[PDB]
Design a protein around this ligand. Sequence first.
Ligand SMILES: *[C@@H]1O[C@H](CO)[C@@H](O)[C@H](O)[C@H]1NC(C)=O
Ligand SMILES: *[C@@H]1O[C@H](CO)[C@@H](O)[C@H](O)[C@H]1NC(C)=O
Ligand SMILES: *[C@@H]1O[C@H](CO)[C@@H](O)[C@H](O)[C@H]1NC(C)=O
Ligand SMILES: *[C@@H]1O[C@H](CO)[C@@H](O)[C@H](O)[C@H]1NC(C)=O
Ligand SMILES: *[C@H]1O[C@H](CO)[C@@H](O)[C@H](O)[C@H]1NC(C)=O
Ligand SMILES: *[C@H]1O[C@H](CO)[C@@H](O)[C@H](O)[C@H]1NC(C)=O
Ligand SMILES: [Mg+2]
Ligand SMILES: [Mg+2]
Ligand SMILES: [Mg+2]
Ligand SMILES: [Mg+2]
Ligand SMILES: [Mg+2]
Ligand SMILES: [Mg+2]
Ligand SMILES: [Mg+2]
Ligand SMILES: [Mg+2]
Ligand SMILES: [Mg+2]
Ligand SMILES: [Mg+2]
Lengths: 532, 532
Amino acid sequence: SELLVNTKSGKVMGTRVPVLSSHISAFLGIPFAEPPVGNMRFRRPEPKKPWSGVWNASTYPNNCQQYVDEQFPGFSGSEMWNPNREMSEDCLYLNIWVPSPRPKSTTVMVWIYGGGFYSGSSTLDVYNGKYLAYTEEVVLVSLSYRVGAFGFLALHGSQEAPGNVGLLDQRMALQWVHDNIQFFGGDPKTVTIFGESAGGASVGMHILSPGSRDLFRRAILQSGSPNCPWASVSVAEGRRRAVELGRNLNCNLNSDEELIHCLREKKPQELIDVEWNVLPFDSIFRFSFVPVIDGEFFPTSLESMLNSGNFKKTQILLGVNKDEGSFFLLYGAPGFSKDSESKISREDFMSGVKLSVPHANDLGLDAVTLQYTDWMDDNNGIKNRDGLDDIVGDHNVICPLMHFVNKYTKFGNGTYLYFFNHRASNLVWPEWMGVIHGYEIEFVFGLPLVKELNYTAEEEALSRRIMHYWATFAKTGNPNEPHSQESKWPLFTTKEQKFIDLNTEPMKVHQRLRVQMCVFWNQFLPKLLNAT
Amino acid sequence: SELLVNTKSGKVMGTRVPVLSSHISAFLGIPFAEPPVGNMRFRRPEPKKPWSGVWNASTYPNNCQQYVDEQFPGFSGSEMWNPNREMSEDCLYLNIWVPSPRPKSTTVMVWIYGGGFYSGSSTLDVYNGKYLAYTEEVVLVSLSYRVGAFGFLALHGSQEAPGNVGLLDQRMALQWVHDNIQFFGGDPKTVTIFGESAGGASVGMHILSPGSRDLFRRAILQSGSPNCPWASVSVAEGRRRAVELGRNLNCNLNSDEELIHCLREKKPQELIDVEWNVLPFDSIFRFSFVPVIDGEFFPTSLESMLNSGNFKKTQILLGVNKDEGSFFLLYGAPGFSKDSESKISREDFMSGVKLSVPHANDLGLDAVTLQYTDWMDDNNGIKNRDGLDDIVGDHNVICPLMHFVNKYTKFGNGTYLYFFNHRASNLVWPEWMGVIHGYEIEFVFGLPLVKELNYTAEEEALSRRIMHYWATFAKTGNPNEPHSQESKWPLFTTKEQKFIDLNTEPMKVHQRLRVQMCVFWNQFLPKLLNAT
Ligand SMILES: *[C@@H]1O[C@H](CO)[C@@H](O)[C@H](O)[C@H]1NC(C)=O
Ligand SMILES: *[C@@H]1O[C@H](CO)[C@@H](O)[C@H](O)[C@H]1NC(C)=O
Ligand SMILES: *[C@@H]1O[C@H](CO)[C@@H](O)[C@H](O)[C@H]1NC(C)=O
Ligand SMILES: *[C@@H]1O[C@H](CO)[C@@H](O)[C@H](O)[C@H]1NC(C)=O
Ligand SMILES: *[C@H]1O[C@H](CO)[C@@H](O)[C@H](O)[C@H]1NC(C)=O
Ligand SMILES: *[C@H]1O[C@H](CO)[C@@H](O)[C@H](O)[C@H]1NC(C)=O
Ligand SMILES: [Mg+2]
Ligand SMILES: [Mg+2]
Ligand SMILES: [Mg+2]
Ligand SMILES: [Mg+2]
Ligand SMILES: [Mg+2]
Ligand SMILES: [Mg+2]
Ligand SMILES: [Mg+2]
Ligand SMILES: [Mg+2]
Ligand SMILES: [Mg+2]
Ligand SMILES: [Mg+2]
């Protein structure tokens, strides 16, 4: 049977799922590691002990314990991101979508969800791999990893909570793919990992880490990068937040042992409730427990690794969305509303700047503010709002990714950059928010192909176009189909620095993606903050 | 006789000079102070001892000893600024242009030439007061003052060279006007001082200094301001440059007395030759001996005086030219030529930035460079050239004047701001230089009315329009003629901050004159340099 597959860990029973007037094989909820529960909370993952019999992989697995956003109850805009399955520490499972008939050895794509390392699921509707798997005849895998303290609490030195375990749960699933994806008709030698936001960062991080480089062929990074200011913390900061978490839960902070002895006895929700209390500053686009530069998973600092070319050299495709900042302003900046144009007064604008660059000293805040203020019209509400969006977006996503793309292209074997700027005709979020962070996902997973979702023809066209770039890229290391006749997406070069739009209009090649502001964020500001 | 006038210092014999198919009285070379020669070099001025007989005031006086620019020999563009008369320490004279028939008591205008306090003359063709005096029926006075070491060498404490003496020679001439201008048919109670570049600064400085406030009614400042970074130095810097000058001339630096004993024995040219050697940094738009914040002429720092409103409160009219920087780049920045478009390479561009802000530390130079670099097209030659022009212009003239105008309007009794941006159709300087620093002068003095000068009708119109604004303003404290029907030049307000163009096209009202860059220069950069 096509739905029965024997893996090195045991037999698995898939399920035939319908997809666009046809069907395909789906092996959902396959375990790749032992349930990281009890004495195992915070510890690195352990490969799943082989099981006897046939594992039922027909339903979706549970979602890792995480903070659930309830800012907008019943609003599909936000709940589309909340866990749609039961929450449980036992959550290290992976889902697979195999074409039917099963291909012999085709291109595989592994999805690493985002969520700022504090949330995320592999089972969200917007991550349904059938449409992509089916349409571009690829074996699509959707892994999972621990978020929050569970996946990133870091007491460096300790082996009971070494940190980056979540990043390890990812490596393991990627490992399991390396060892078993062949049995599903997927070529382990053509695995392309791709993720968004924290997922994008995670991707870049596996490029960086020596311990992951041989676990994939190519990589796609979406609105995220290893060097994103929120993507990680030092060992000192990590420890500080672990002890702070402890202090928040009347934990014995006298030894790395009993601090964890304590954390392991607390119910998951207890940790989640006091999770954000350990952040250093009042802010936005900052998350409590994230990857830590331990010196093992990350040999040296991310900057030094990027400058020395100490990272996997392959081809990479990546880009950002036009309005990467609105989502975060809506949630944490004063003046923003889901029910109005969100015109920001000069006073809120400044509250936002400070909330956006919490680590900057007053001279820095002044630099930022000056850089994003139109002094000819400083009290324009629309301009302040759009400014904050660019600040948050430029500082947290776009510029860090551009620094990465520039640093990487000097050693890589090919770079393809995009700028998604298409606002869905059915978006439920208000207009002011534009092309929000993460809303390119649905286009990558083919959601516009589902007529019920109420998308427009042109939008179906864009999605089909994107899925193909991604697929073709994962398959050849080049978004462009050979001899093809449409406009070619130029390779990003250190000299030309070309990228393309991603919308329903004819493709436009561009250059130096927001080089002006990124020169500020990547070079000037860093120097100002280090000097002063 | 109309050409004979008895003043409190003695009788003076004027001369009838032709002006635009008519004539007017001109009393040239009238002494207002004792020849600051010998033991008097560097000392404050002494009022001219009354003389017996009739003083021959029919020819122009000598020009103060100064550095003469010989960069472009025989080029009218530069020589129009060099002394056109014999040079001599005995140079404290003033010229007057009285309408004929002699008015009873009309508006007087006193011109203070510029030249960065190191050069300048009252006898230049571009400062011929007949055209303005005749056309707008005003008594036009053109004073003179010591420049260079002679007028500004400062050894604070010493009374043998107290500093600011040049600024005093100005006050004295202004005093003589207060005491005698009535005999020439000029109302001493309606004296409007107006100057350009250093002259503009000097004007603002008489507004500031308590010892000058009662010596004029109104004031016009052109492309210059009291707070211009080059317009003055601290007492410490002043002293340092005096001792440095000494050291340059094998002078005994052991006592303020014999340092001067030495300087007074050196021939003028000897001082001029080593004059620029005392500047702190390699630079442009910086001059050796300039006003010093002594604590007497300037009670406290210029900044504190401006913030506390410690200055004469009257109406003021002022503005700048569009390309205030090209003149200086041509002379001191690498890459510039009088014979080419002057496209500046990225390398020269940076040499220029550093030469333009010699006091800035690397972080500052980075700020400046970042602020004026178009990273989408950083190697555009035309863009770098135009950038340097704005940097020099914004930093040395426009922004300091805007800081001044903003600070002043909060206490003043009326402010009128202009932005001269008309390029003369007969300019001899290359196109790239645009509306050069100081080339609005000819329009203020009516040179376009002289058909031989080969100006265009529209240009004659502009000049006649300017002369009238200046005149009308000096006469009423408002550039606008009552009930007049043309477009009114709006008052500059702290809230509206309106100003007008000054070119051959219909008048356009504007706002926030280069507020973006001036926020950088007036607020951000100062803070960056003080913090780091
Ligand atoms: C598990 O598989 C069985 C058939 O083997 C079937 O009931 C169903 O697909 C799965 N059970 C659940 C949770 O529905
Ligand atoms: C990738 O590597 C191959 C093998 O050396 C080389 O021929 C090719 O030029 C590289 N492609 C790019 C654009 O990096
Ligand atoms: C001085 O006045 C006399 C007449 O009194 C006449 O020669 C001329 O205008 C002046 N002298 C000079 C320097 O030409
Ligand atoms: C100037 O001062 C007079 C006298 O107080 C006042 O009435 C007038 O409003 C002032 N004008 C301006 C615009 O400062
Ligand atoms: C199209 O989209 C909506 C929103 O998800 C969905 O509920 C339904 O399939 C369509 N809307 C309707 C009911 O027409
Ligand atoms: C107009 O201007 C020139 C330049 O100053 C001047 O020499 C002359 O009066 C006119 N040019 C000629 C000779 O036509
Ligand atoms: Mg324990
Ligand atoms: Mg214990
Ligand atoms: Mg926006
Ligand atoms: Mg296709
Ligand atoms: Mg295809
Ligand atoms: Mg002596
Ligand atoms: Mg002596
Ligand atoms: Mg220019
Ligand atoms: Mg007139
Ligand atoms: Mg008139």
